[PDB]
Amino acid sequence: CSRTFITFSDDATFEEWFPQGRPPKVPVREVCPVTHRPALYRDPVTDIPYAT
Amino acid sequence: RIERIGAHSHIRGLGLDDALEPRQASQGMVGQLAARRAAGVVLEMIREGKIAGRAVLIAGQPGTGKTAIAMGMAQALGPDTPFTAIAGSEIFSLEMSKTEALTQAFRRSIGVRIKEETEIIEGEVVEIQIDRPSKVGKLTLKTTEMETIYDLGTKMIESLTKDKVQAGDVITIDKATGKISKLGRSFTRARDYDAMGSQTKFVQCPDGELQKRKEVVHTVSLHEIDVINSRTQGFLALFSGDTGEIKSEVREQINAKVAEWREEGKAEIIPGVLFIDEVHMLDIESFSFLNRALESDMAPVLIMATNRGITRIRGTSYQSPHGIPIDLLDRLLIVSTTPYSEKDTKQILRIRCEEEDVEMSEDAYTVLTRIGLETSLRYAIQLITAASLVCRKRKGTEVQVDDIKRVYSLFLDESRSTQYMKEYQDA
Amino acid sequence: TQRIASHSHVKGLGLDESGLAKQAASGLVGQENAREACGVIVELIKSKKMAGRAVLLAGPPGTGKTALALAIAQELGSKVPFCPMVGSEVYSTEIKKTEVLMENFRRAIGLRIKETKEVYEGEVTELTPCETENPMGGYGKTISHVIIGLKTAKGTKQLKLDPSIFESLQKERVEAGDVIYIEANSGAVKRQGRCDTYATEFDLEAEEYVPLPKGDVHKKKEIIQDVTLHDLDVANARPQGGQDILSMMGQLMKPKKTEITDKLRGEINKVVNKYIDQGIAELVPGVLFVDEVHMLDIECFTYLHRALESSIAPIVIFASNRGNCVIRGTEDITSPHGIPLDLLDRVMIIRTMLYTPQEMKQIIKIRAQTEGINISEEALNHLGEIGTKTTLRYSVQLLTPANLLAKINGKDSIEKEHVEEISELFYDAKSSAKILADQQ
Amino acid sequence: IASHSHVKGLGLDESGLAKQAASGLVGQENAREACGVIVELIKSKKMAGRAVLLAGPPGTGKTALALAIAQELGSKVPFCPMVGSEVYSTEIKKTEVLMENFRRAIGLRIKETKEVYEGEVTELTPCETENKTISHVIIGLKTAKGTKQLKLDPSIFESLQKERVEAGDVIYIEANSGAVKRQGRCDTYATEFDLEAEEYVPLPKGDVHKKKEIIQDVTLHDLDVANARPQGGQDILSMMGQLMKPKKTEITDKLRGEINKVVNKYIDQGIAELVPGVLFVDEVHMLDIECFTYLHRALESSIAPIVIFASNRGNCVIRGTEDITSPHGIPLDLLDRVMIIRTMLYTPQEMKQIIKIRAQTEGINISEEALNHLGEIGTKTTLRYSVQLLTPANLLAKINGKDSIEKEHVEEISELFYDAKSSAKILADQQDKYM
Amino acid sequence: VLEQFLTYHGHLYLRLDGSTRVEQRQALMERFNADKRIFCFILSTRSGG
Amino acid sequence: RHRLSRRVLLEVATAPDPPPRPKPVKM
Ligand SMILES: Nc1ncnc2c1ncn2[C@@H]1O[C@H](COP(=O)(O)OP(=O)(O)O)[C@@H](O)[C@H]1O
Ligand SMILES: Nc1ncnc2c1ncn2[C@@H]1O[C@H](COP(=O)(O)OP(=O)(O)O)[C@@H](O)[C@H]1O
Ligand SMILES: Nc1ncnc2c1ncn2[C@@H]1O[C@H](COP(=O)(O)OP(=O)(O)O)[C@@H](O)[C@H]1O
């Protein structure tokens, strides 16, 4: 048989890699109060996600 | 595996005895006893190899076995001895001169063999431990007779990681240069398949001693040596035939260094053979250069095939035999190949049809020998393959006389083609 | 659809199972004695063994030579390689003639290669370890495997990889929620990028955005490439590598484009024989068609009947329109077909017979059917008549302009007056030569 | 080794007279005693542009005397053998080939001193400075004799980085050229591990810095090429590999200028000495009229060396002209600038001794009867053919088991291998069957 | 020169030249116990005592 | 279509205006 047993357990920086993010998606349709359409860009002056 | 049977694939070597006595139909060749004996004498002088720059000229009728004798000599000489086959028209290059192409052809059939005693370590890795803080580790090498441990250094670990060798792997380590070479996976190399594994090709572990001293040999031709020494682009041997090595120190230095190597016992010499087929294509300049190129101590032996007779020399208007000037013809030893008789043509056809795996009837052999004595032996030979296809098409077992006759009526030779060329035919 | 060429009508030799020739099958009419002769070499080609053969289709200009020579290719199918080259393509300014010939020779030879690879794809969900006791003194617990969750359009599955794959992941610097491609035979991992399901609203980062990974998380499909030996030759001669400045010379046109026998023998042939005996590639020996071979010179012919004797060469089909002519490259050496006797005695000859009025009429009918022309029975007979005088080429070329005149005069079928007017508007070789002789 | 291994000198007496049979040569007394004058003229180092023409039928020893001249001159002078067909180069000018051959036919022996730094390096510290590139590099070179810290250039530091050296290894450095080699890590570190991918070399001995003198030899063509296609260093001149990279097509402006200037500067200061050699141009009959005409100025130049052409034709059409003929295939314009030397056609007696010498040089124990039969074979055939027949007879004797060559062996060999005239007669008999 | 030609066969050895200090000689005599990959020992005639 | 006209080129050479100062955190 032939196996692999890489080990770094003398520190926590290794053990910290696996749970790094595990985060889901939360960019959603930023509907605008003009046309209710697939919002395109956020206005840098009003910070509103306008589409049209 | 699949390399088709060419026109000369039937001869496996000159059918000669220990005393260079040619047999009638042994080892593929048939008849032509005198020329075969001459070929054997020159082949023995070649395998001896203490005289350089000797030329032989195999002249004869078209289709009498000159290229056949050449291929037979090549086969009987086998590997470990350079044999370069070149047509006379191959030296007419656009990027290099004819003399330079001839120098290349000569130096390409001169072998230099460096024999080295570099020791190595061959075994099956059992474990490869390594700790990164420079990282340091150990290795456990196992052979069927013993096991041992080694402390791995920095560059050793670097090369092992680059090659990505693991446990159960059979590897060889060049202790002088540290070069790693994995030969395969041992039965232990089984990775305990529980993941994306797709390799299970196992092999026996290495036997013998752990740290053995084997012998390596590096054989390269003078041509390759000068090519790789010409300029920093040391890949022209494969990259492209762009060449033109000046005759300055480069080639003279190759020669001088090979002389010192031969003297000190590093690599002495292995001469070679240059088969120039259809040498009448060479130019007067080519012949004039060969005149003195055959005089060099690093000159391999050459054998030139000839069909021409009393004909003008290319590049001039001088009528000379063989289409070669007497100046060069004087250095050569001329061997004349005679035409094959009825029983020789029949035996050649039989051997050819048995090599290409086609069973012919006793009357098929007779009619084919008739056709081959009235017309060219090459046409008779080419008729066999065509006649076998009609038989296979009609679901036969062995070629009959009617199939050969159908093929003869279907395909035309040069004489019948000319006699059918009765119209203008856009002359 | 595509352009209608001069030989777009031929589809095969139209030969019976017993080896006999049909009347007008596969677009070829008559020509039985030559169509059977070349169907024999078709079976020769099918029999991949017994190579190093050459066949010479000789005859008057334009009888059936090129037609049946390229119909051989249709009978053989596109599967086997068929390399055409006119005798005028040998003369080059950057490479020698005997090298163009060798390239074409071992270019006609094909080599199909099969390979099966397993592939992974899917937006990764999360990675976790598989802890285990310490294999050595109590410095800490180790990891045996890494569990990775891959989600695709079909479903989400977890898979176990080795610590080496996890180290590869770490040095690749991917995170949870991106698209990765994995292979088990090789072990390499590719980072495709973020998935379209997480598409942004504004972000401009262009990475060839990966769409939803449609399909299973594990897919196995066989690749079958069709590479020739000349392709390997040119690739190993001028490799398109990376940052290896020897390769950075791609900015040059690179004349001096000749190969080397050392390589040709020791490097490319061994790797092909190994694959063939291992079962990875099947050799597809092919055909090398050489029309107007009379254009080659004495040196080209000498090299041709040295290479043809090679055990590796493909099967060659030369074509000849000339009769007793002088061999090019020589001062004055007359030989049949413009080919030296030494080469003629090494190739099988097939005489392409001349056509009769009825046969030329059938050929004109087939060409009109192929060109989509609605020629009438009277125009067809007139074309046959005026083609019995001149050559078949001129007789059958009077179908596009006649159809144009018809369409312009408001017709849907070539009539007699249309072809009569076209025959007076255009002339043939003999008619033009007569006017040239009448004039100074 | 054959066809030139028996000649090792002209075999002339102290008075310059040709000896009957000595130094591997027999007969040709006139030709050899005349070539003695040529070797004396070459060794005098006083003349330039002189030319000789060894004229005679094929196989009359003209090339033999040409090589005997070189053997007499020794290996100290450059002897350049060349074939007339070499002028037809596809990369450089036809006259350029000939002029570069003339240039390499001249020698130059020069004694030069060069310095070398070597020793087990203790440490390599790159002294940094703001420009923001590395300023200098201090290297501590240890040796069995002593130890020295030395400051070297950033170019040498970069060369060390290319070598991939590390502190504690052994390196060989040169300041003249600037190349640095890695001889391997010091032997004292070989005990560090059980196995390593490292070459080990012991501590260099002697002084860390040492200057040594070498008496090298190079031809004028060597300097010409070194200055035309320079490589040097300290720059990215390696682009030479793609710039043009043919034979450089040299130019007179620097061929006759800067090179001559610098070599005279080296000579007149006791550093170098001119060593004119010989240019043997075999097969001169296939040279074009252009080459023959340029040979006029080449020989009338004050720097050309002693040239030796070989004439084998009686009277034929000159190459490149196609309509005019002259003796030796050389125009009378060049033929008037040479000292022709006859090569007499050999007689049966001299040919017998030549065959004997060739046999005794090729390690062959030929019997007297076989030798005398080779006499008839050579009187019926060419000397070269009769002498070529030797080795196959030795192989056949070894096969038959006899320790000497007898009549039957040479008879069998002659019957197996035909001669030029016999083959020509066979072809004339089979005229309309050889194509 | 002997060291130069012995270090090529892949073997470890040590010097005992007269230039070596007495402390170095003592260190080497101590290291000459349980030697790894060492079989030959170099000596001199005068300073060999 | 967007070739700068001399009229607009002359007009633009006038008093500029300051950029906005946005701070919305609402709809
Ligand atoms: N002695 C022989 N034994 C067997 N086959 C022969 C013999 N001589 C000639 N052949 C066959 O004849 C065919 C053509 O003859 P070849 O050897 O090419 O003669 P040439 O070179 O004069 O044309 C070859 O395929 C060869 O196999
Ligand atoms: N048997 C045939 N059936 C149909 N068309 C033919 C036939 N033979 C010749 N042709 C036509 O004749 C034309 C010229 O033939 P081609 O192959 O060019 O002969 P060549 O090259 O000798 O002129 C081709 O376009 C082809 O369509
Ligand atoms: N004087 C001589 N003594 C011994 N051998 C000779 C002599 N002259 C010529 N030979 C032999 O004749 C062969 C050919 O002579 P060569 O020098 O080639 O004549 P040429 O230069 O006129 O062609 C040489 O191999 C040499 O062995």
Coordinates of C-alpha atoms in Angstrom, one line a residue, chain D residues 17-429:
Chain D
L17 CA 68.5 16.3 -52.8
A18 CA 65.7 13.7 -53.2
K19 CA 66.5 10.4 -51.6
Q20 CA 65.6 7.2 -53.6
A21 CA 63.2 5.7 -51.0
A22 CA 62.7 7.2 -47.6
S23 CA 60.1 9.0 -45.4
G24 CA 57.4 6.8 -47.0
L25 CA 58.0 8.1 -50.6
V26 CA 59.7 6.6 -53.6
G27 CA 60.5 8.1 -57.0
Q28 CA 59.4 11.6 -57.9
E29 CA 62.9 12.8 -57.1
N30 CA 62.5 16.0 -59.1
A31 CA 59.1 16.8 -57.7
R32 CA 60.2 16.2 -54.1
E33 CA 63.5 18.1 -54.3
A34 CA 61.5 21.0 -55.9
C35 CA 59.0 20.9 -53.1
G36 CA 62.0 21.1 -50.8
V37 CA 62.6 24.6 -52.1
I38 CA 58.9 25.4 -51.4
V39 CA 59.2 24.2 -47.8
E40 CA 62.3 26.3 -47.4
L41 CA 60.6 29.3 -48.9
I42 CA 57.7 28.8 -46.4
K43 CA 60.0 28.4 -43.4
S44 CA 61.9 31.6 -44.4
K45 CA 58.8 33.7 -43.5
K46 CA 60.2 36.3 -46.0
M47 CA 57.9 36.1 -49.0
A48 CA 54.1 36.4 -49.5
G49 CA 51.7 35.5 -52.3
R50 CA 54.0 32.9 -53.8
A51 CA 52.1 30.0 -55.5
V52 CA 53.0 26.5 -56.7
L53 CA 51.0 24.2 -59.0
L54 CA 51.6 20.4 -58.6
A55 CA 50.5 19.3 -62.0
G56 CA 50.1 15.7 -63.1
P57 CA 47.7 12.8 -64.1
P58 CA 45.5 11.3 -61.4
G59 CA 47.4 9.2 -58.8
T60 CA 50.9 10.6 -59.4
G61 CA 51.5 11.7 -55.8
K62 CA 50.7 15.4 -56.1
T63 CA 48.5 15.3 -53.0
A64 CA 51.0 13.1 -51.4
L65 CA 53.7 15.7 -51.9
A66 CA 51.2 18.4 -50.7
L67 CA 50.8 16.6 -47.4
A68 CA 54.5 15.8 -47.2
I69 CA 55.2 19.5 -47.3
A70 CA 52.9 20.0 -44.3
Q71 CA 54.5 17.1 -42.4
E72 CA 57.9 18.7 -43.0
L73 CA 56.6 22.1 -41.9
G74 CA 55.3 20.5 -38.8
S75 CA 52.3 21.4 -36.7
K76 CA 53.5 24.8 -35.7
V77 CA 52.4 26.5 -38.9
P78 CA 48.8 26.6 -40.1
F79 CA 48.3 24.2 -43.1
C80 CA 44.9 24.9 -44.6
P81 CA 43.6 22.2 -47.0
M82 CA 40.8 23.3 -49.2
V83 CA 38.9 21.9 -52.2
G84 CA 37.9 24.1 -55.1
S85 CA 34.3 23.2 -54.7
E86 CA 34.2 24.9 -51.2
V87 CA 34.1 28.4 -52.8
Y88 CA 30.5 27.7 -53.9
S89 CA 29.0 28.8 -50.5
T90 CA 25.3 29.6 -50.2
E91 CA 25.7 32.1 -47.3
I92 CA 28.8 34.2 -48.0
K93 CA 30.3 35.6 -51.2
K94 CA 32.3 33.2 -53.4
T95 CA 35.3 35.5 -53.1
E96 CA 34.7 36.0 -49.4
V97 CA 35.2 32.2 -48.9
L98 CA 38.5 32.4 -50.7
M99 CA 39.8 35.5 -48.9
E100 CA 38.8 34.0 -45.5
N101 CA 40.6 30.8 -46.4
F102 CA 43.7 32.9 -47.3
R103 CA 43.4 34.7 -44.0
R104 CA 43.2 31.5 -41.9
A105 CA 46.1 30.1 -43.9
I106 CA 48.2 32.6 -41.9
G107 CA 49.2 32.0 -38.2
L108 CA 50.0 34.0 -35.2
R109 CA 51.6 32.8 -31.9
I110 CA 51.0 35.1 -29.0
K111 CA 52.0 34.8 -25.3
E112 CA 49.3 36.3 -22.9
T113 CA 49.0 36.6 -19.2
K114 CA 45.6 36.1 -17.5
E115 CA 44.5 36.3 -13.9
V116 CA 42.2 33.9 -12.0
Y117 CA 40.4 34.1 -8.6
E118 CA 39.6 30.7 -7.0
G119 CA 38.9 29.3 -3.6
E120 CA 36.2 27.9 -1.3
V121 CA 33.8 30.9 -0.9
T122 CA 33.0 31.7 2.7
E123 CA 30.3 34.2 2.1
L124 CA 28.9 36.4 -0.7
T125 CA 27.4 39.8 0.5
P126 CA 25.9 42.1 -2.1
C127 CA 26.8 45.7 -1.2
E128 CA 23.6 47.6 -2.0
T129 CA 23.3 51.3 -3.0
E130 CA 20.7 53.6 -4.4
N131 CA 20.9 54.5 -8.1
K132 CA 18.1 51.1 -6.7
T133 CA 20.3 48.3 -8.0
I134 CA 23.0 46.3 -6.4
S135 CA 26.3 48.3 -6.2
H136 CA 29.1 45.7 -5.6
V137 CA 29.6 42.2 -4.2
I138 CA 32.1 41.1 -1.5
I139 CA 33.1 37.5 -1.8
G140 CA 35.2 35.7 0.8
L141 CA 37.4 33.2 -1.1
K142 CA 39.2 30.6 1.1
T143 CA 42.1 28.5 0.0
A144 CA 44.4 25.9 1.4
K145 CA 47.1 28.6 1.2
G146 CA 45.2 31.6 2.4
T147 CA 41.9 33.6 2.3
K148 CA 40.9 36.9 0.8
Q149 CA 37.8 39.1 0.7
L150 CA 37.4 40.5 -2.8
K151 CA 35.0 43.0 -4.4
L152 CA 33.6 41.9 -7.8
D153 CA 31.2 43.4 -10.2
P154 CA 27.4 43.1 -10.4
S155 CA 27.9 41.3 -13.7
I156 CA 30.0 38.6 -11.9
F157 CA 27.3 38.5 -9.1
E158 CA 24.7 37.9 -11.8
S159 CA 26.8 35.2 -13.4
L160 CA 27.1 33.5 -9.9
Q161 CA 23.3 33.7 -9.6
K162 CA 23.0 32.0 -13.0
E163 CA 25.4 29.3 -11.8
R164 CA 23.0 29.0 -8.8
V165 CA 25.9 28.9 -6.3
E166 CA 25.6 29.1 -2.5
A167 CA 27.9 30.1 0.3
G168 CA 30.5 27.4 1.1
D169 CA 31.0 26.0 -2.4
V170 CA 34.0 26.1 -4.8
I171 CA 34.0 28.4 -7.8
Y172 CA 36.5 29.2 -10.6
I173 CA 36.6 32.9 -11.6
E174 CA 38.4 34.7 -14.4
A175 CA 38.6 38.5 -14.7
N176 CA 39.8 38.7 -18.3
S177 CA 36.8 36.9 -19.8
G178 CA 34.5 37.2 -16.9
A179 CA 33.1 33.6 -16.9
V180 CA 32.6 31.8 -13.6
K181 CA 32.2 28.1 -13.2
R182 CA 30.9 26.1 -10.2
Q183 CA 33.4 23.3 -9.5
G184 CA 31.0 21.9 -6.8
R185 CA 30.6 22.3 -3.1
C186 CA 33.6 21.9 -0.9
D187 CA 34.5 18.3 0.0
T188 CA 34.2 19.3 3.7
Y189 CA 30.4 19.5 3.3
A190 CA 30.1 16.0 1.7
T191 CA 29.5 14.6 5.2
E192 CA 26.5 16.8 5.7
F193 CA 24.0 14.3 4.2
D194 CA 23.9 10.7 3.0
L195 CA 23.2 11.7 -0.6
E196 CA 22.8 15.0 -2.4
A197 CA 22.3 16.3 -5.9
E198 CA 25.6 18.2 -5.6
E199 CA 29.0 17.8 -7.1
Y200 CA 31.8 17.8 -4.5
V201 CA 35.3 19.2 -5.1
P202 CA 38.0 19.7 -2.5
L203 CA 39.4 23.0 -1.3
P204 CA 41.3 24.7 -4.1
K205 CA 45.1 24.9 -3.4
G206 CA 47.6 27.7 -4.0
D207 CA 47.0 31.5 -3.9
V208 CA 43.4 32.8 -4.1
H209 CA 44.5 35.2 -6.9
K210 CA 47.0 33.9 -9.5
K211 CA 48.3 35.2 -12.8
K212 CA 49.5 32.7 -15.4
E213 CA 51.0 33.0 -18.8
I214 CA 49.9 30.9 -21.8
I215 CA 51.5 30.8 -25.3
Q216 CA 48.5 30.4 -27.5
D217 CA 48.2 30.3 -31.3
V218 CA 45.5 31.7 -33.5
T219 CA 45.1 32.6 -37.2
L220 CA 44.4 36.0 -38.6
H221 CA 41.0 34.7 -39.6
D222 CA 40.3 33.8 -36.0
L223 CA 40.7 37.5 -35.0
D224 CA 38.7 38.5 -38.2
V225 CA 35.8 36.3 -37.1
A226 CA 36.1 37.3 -33.4
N227 CA 35.7 41.0 -34.5
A228 CA 33.1 40.4 -37.2
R229 CA 30.7 38.2 -35.1
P230 CA 31.6 39.4 -31.6
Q231 CA 30.2 37.6 -28.5
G232 CA 32.0 39.1 -25.6
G233 CA 29.9 39.7 -22.5
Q234 CA 28.6 42.3 -20.0
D235 CA 25.7 42.9 -22.5
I236 CA 22.8 41.1 -24.1
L237 CA 24.8 40.5 -27.3
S238 CA 23.6 36.9 -27.2
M239 CA 21.0 38.2 -29.7
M240 CA 23.7 37.1 -32.1
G241 CA 21.7 33.8 -32.1
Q242 CA 18.9 35.5 -34.2
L243 CA 20.4 38.8 -35.5
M244 CA 21.6 37.4 -38.8
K245 CA 23.7 34.3 -38.0
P246 CA 25.1 33.4 -41.3
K247 CA 28.8 33.5 -42.2
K248 CA 29.3 37.1 -41.4
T249 CA 30.2 38.2 -45.0
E250 CA 33.4 40.0 -43.8
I251 CA 34.4 43.4 -45.2
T252 CA 37.8 44.7 -46.3
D253 CA 37.5 47.9 -44.3
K254 CA 38.1 45.9 -41.1
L255 CA 39.8 42.8 -42.6
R256 CA 42.8 44.9 -43.8
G257 CA 42.4 47.7 -41.3
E258 CA 41.8 47.4 -37.5
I259 CA 42.8 43.7 -37.4
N260 CA 46.2 44.3 -39.1
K261 CA 46.7 47.4 -36.9
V262 CA 46.1 45.6 -33.6
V263 CA 48.1 42.5 -34.6
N264 CA 51.0 44.7 -35.6
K265 CA 50.7 46.6 -32.3
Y266 CA 50.8 43.2 -30.5
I267 CA 53.8 42.0 -32.6
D268 CA 56.0 45.1 -32.4
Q269 CA 55.8 45.1 -28.6
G270 CA 57.0 41.5 -28.2
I271 CA 53.7 40.0 -27.3
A272 CA 53.0 38.2 -30.6
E273 CA 54.9 36.7 -33.5
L274 CA 53.6 36.2 -37.1
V275 CA 53.6 32.5 -38.2
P276 CA 52.8 32.3 -41.9
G277 CA 51.6 28.9 -43.0
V278 CA 50.5 27.2 -46.2
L279 CA 47.3 27.2 -48.2
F280 CA 46.9 23.9 -50.1
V281 CA 44.0 24.1 -52.5
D282 CA 43.4 20.7 -54.0
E283 CA 41.2 20.3 -57.1
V284 CA 41.7 23.9 -58.4
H285 CA 40.3 23.0 -61.8
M286 CA 36.6 23.5 -60.8
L287 CA 37.2 27.1 -59.7
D288 CA 35.2 29.8 -61.6
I289 CA 36.8 32.4 -63.8
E290 CA 35.8 34.9 -61.1
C291 CA 37.9 33.1 -58.5
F292 CA 40.8 32.7 -60.9
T293 CA 40.8 36.4 -61.6
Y294 CA 40.5 37.4 -57.9
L295 CA 43.5 35.0 -57.3
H296 CA 45.5 37.6 -59.3
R297 CA 45.2 40.3 -56.6
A298 CA 45.3 37.6 -53.9
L299 CA 48.7 36.5 -55.0
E300 CA 49.9 40.0 -55.8
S301 CA 48.9 41.1 -52.3
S302 CA 51.7 41.6 -49.8
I303 CA 50.1 39.4 -47.1
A304 CA 48.9 36.3 -48.9
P305 CA 50.6 33.1 -47.8
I306 CA 52.3 30.4 -49.9
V307 CA 49.6 28.7 -51.9
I308 CA 49.7 25.2 -53.5
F309 CA 47.2 24.2 -56.2
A310 CA 46.8 20.7 -57.7
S311 CA 46.3 20.3 -61.4
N312 CA 44.9 17.0 -62.7
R313 CA 43.5 17.9 -66.2
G314 CA 45.5 18.3 -69.3
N315 CA 43.4 20.7 -71.4
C316 CA 39.7 21.3 -70.9
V317 CA 37.1 24.2 -71.0
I318 CA 37.4 26.7 -68.2
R319 CA 34.6 26.7 -65.7
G320 CA 32.3 29.8 -65.7
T321 CA 33.3 30.7 -69.3
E322 CA 31.9 27.7 -71.2
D323 CA 33.6 28.6 -74.5
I324 CA 37.4 29.0 -73.7
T325 CA 39.9 26.3 -72.8
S326 CA 43.3 26.5 -71.3
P327 CA 45.9 24.1 -69.8
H328 CA 45.1 22.7 -66.4
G329 CA 41.7 24.2 -66.6
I330 CA 43.3 27.4 -65.3
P331 CA 43.4 30.7 -67.3
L332 CA 46.8 31.7 -68.6
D333 CA 46.5 34.9 -66.5
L334 CA 46.8 32.9 -63.2
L335 CA 49.0 30.2 -64.7
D336 CA 51.6 32.9 -65.3
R337 CA 51.7 33.6 -61.5
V338 CA 52.6 30.1 -60.4
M339 CA 55.6 27.8 -60.4
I340 CA 54.5 24.6 -62.0
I341 CA 55.9 21.3 -60.7
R342 CA 55.6 18.1 -62.7
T343 CA 54.4 14.9 -61.1
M344 CA 55.9 12.0 -63.2
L345 CA 53.7 9.1 -64.0
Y346 CA 54.8 6.0 -62.0
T347 CA 56.6 3.0 -63.5
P348 CA 56.0 -0.7 -62.6
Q349 CA 59.1 -0.8 -60.4
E350 CA 58.2 2.3 -58.4
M351 CA 54.6 1.2 -58.2
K352 CA 55.7 -2.1 -56.7
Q353 CA 57.6 -0.4 -53.9
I354 CA 54.6 1.9 -53.3
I355 CA 52.4 -1.1 -53.0
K356 CA 54.9 -2.7 -50.6
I357 CA 55.0 0.5 -48.5
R358 CA 51.2 0.8 -48.4
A359 CA 50.9 -2.9 -47.4
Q360 CA 53.5 -2.5 -44.6
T361 CA 51.7 0.6 -43.4
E362 CA 48.3 -1.0 -43.4
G363 CA 49.6 -3.8 -41.2
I364 CA 49.5 -6.5 -43.9
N365 CA 52.0 -9.4 -44.3
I366 CA 51.9 -9.8 -48.1
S367 CA 54.1 -12.6 -49.6
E368 CA 56.6 -11.9 -52.3
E369 CA 54.6 -13.8 -54.9
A370 CA 51.4 -11.8 -54.1
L371 CA 53.4 -8.6 -54.2
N372 CA 54.8 -9.4 -57.7
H373 CA 51.4 -10.4 -58.9
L374 CA 50.1 -7.0 -57.7
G375 CA 52.8 -5.7 -60.0
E376 CA 51.1 -7.1 -63.1
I377 CA 47.7 -6.1 -61.6
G378 CA 49.0 -2.5 -61.4
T379 CA 50.6 -2.5 -64.8
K380 CA 47.2 -3.6 -66.2
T381 CA 45.2 -1.2 -64.0
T382 CA 45.7 2.0 -61.9
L383 CA 48.1 2.3 -59.1
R384 CA 45.3 3.4 -56.8
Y385 CA 43.2 0.3 -57.6
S386 CA 46.2 -2.1 -57.3
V387 CA 46.9 -0.6 -53.9
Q388 CA 43.3 -0.6 -52.8
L389 CA 43.1 -4.4 -53.5
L390 CA 45.4 -4.9 -50.5
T391 CA 43.0 -4.9 -47.5
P392 CA 40.3 -7.2 -49.0
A393 CA 43.1 -9.7 -49.6
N394 CA 44.1 -9.5 -46.0
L395 CA 40.5 -10.1 -44.9
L396 CA 40.2 -13.1 -47.3
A397 CA 43.5 -14.5 -45.9
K398 CA 42.2 -14.2 -42.3
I399 CA 39.1 -16.0 -43.4
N400 CA 40.9 -18.8 -45.2
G401 CA 43.2 -19.2 -42.1
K402 CA 46.5 -18.4 -43.7
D403 CA 48.9 -16.0 -42.0
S404 CA 50.1 -14.4 -45.3
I405 CA 48.6 -13.3 -48.6
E406 CA 49.2 -15.7 -51.5
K407 CA 48.6 -15.6 -55.2
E408 CA 45.1 -17.1 -55.0
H409 CA 43.9 -14.5 -52.4
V410 CA 44.8 -11.5 -54.6
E411 CA 43.4 -13.4 -57.7
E412 CA 40.1 -13.8 -55.9
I413 CA 40.0 -10.2 -54.8
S414 CA 40.8 -8.9 -58.3
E415 CA 38.1 -11.2 -59.8
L416 CA 35.6 -10.0 -57.3
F417 CA 36.4 -6.3 -57.7
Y418 CA 36.7 -4.8 -61.1
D419 CA 38.7 -1.7 -62.2
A420 CA 37.6 1.5 -63.9
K421 CA 38.7 0.4 -67.4
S422 CA 37.2 -3.0 -67.1
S423 CA 33.9 -1.5 -65.9
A424 CA 34.0 1.0 -68.8
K425 CA 34.5 -1.9 -71.2
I426 CA 31.6 -3.8 -69.7
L427 CA 29.4 -0.7 -70.1
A428 CA 30.5 -0.3 -73.7
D429 CA 29.6 -3.9 -74.4

